[PDB]
Amino acid sequence: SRWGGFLDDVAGFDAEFFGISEREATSIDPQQRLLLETSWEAIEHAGLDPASLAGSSTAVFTGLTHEDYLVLTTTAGGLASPYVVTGLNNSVASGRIAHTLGLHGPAMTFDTACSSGLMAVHLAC
């Protein structure tokens, strides 16, 4: 294959708005950045102030896979970066969102190949 659907920008991420240092922002998984940004966008699309949800029992679930950024950093050999601990571990995918929004409901990330996109909805239900 030579083709596919690809984002307009992948490395793009508004780390400053969420109070994120450029170092961790450089080392954080772009998938995590996309999830966080689109989650904020969905929250706003609901008409709710994201700041309003702080200190509430709302929960978060997300499906993640294809940790290709691990391959990239391994090839680059920059695994020694301390931000990798929270920049590449799949756990923080939900945890980063929960901490940013200050939510108290359970935060969990999982992987079910190409079925996470709806199994997350089932789990939330």
* Residues forming the site for ligand A1BY8 (CB under 6 A): 71, 79, 84-85, 88-89, 113-114
The interface partner of residue 36, options being ligand A1BY8, a second copy, none and the CB cut-off 5 to 8 Å by kind, is none
Contact 22, 71 (CB under 8 A): no
Q: Which one of the spans 5-13, 37-45, 75-83 is the region binding a second copy (CB under 8 A)?
A: 75-83
Distance between CA 11 and CA 26 in Å, rounded? Answer: 8
Distance between CA 89 and CA 36 in Å, rounded? Answer: 15
Provide, rounded to whole angstroms, the least separation between the CB of residue 34 and ligand A1BY8. Answer: 18
Using CB under 8 A as the binding rule, the residues of this chain from 3 to 42 that contact a second copy are none
Q: Which is nearer to a second copy, 12 or 82 (CB)?
A: 82
90 closest CA partner among 54, 119, 116, 52: 116
- Paired with 103 in beta bridges are 56
Q: What DSSP element (H or E) covers 30?
A: helix 30-45
Interface with a second copy by CB under 8 A: which residues?
54-55, 57, 59-60, 64-65, 67, 70-71, 74-75, 79-82, 84-86, 89-92, 94-96, 98-113, 116, 119
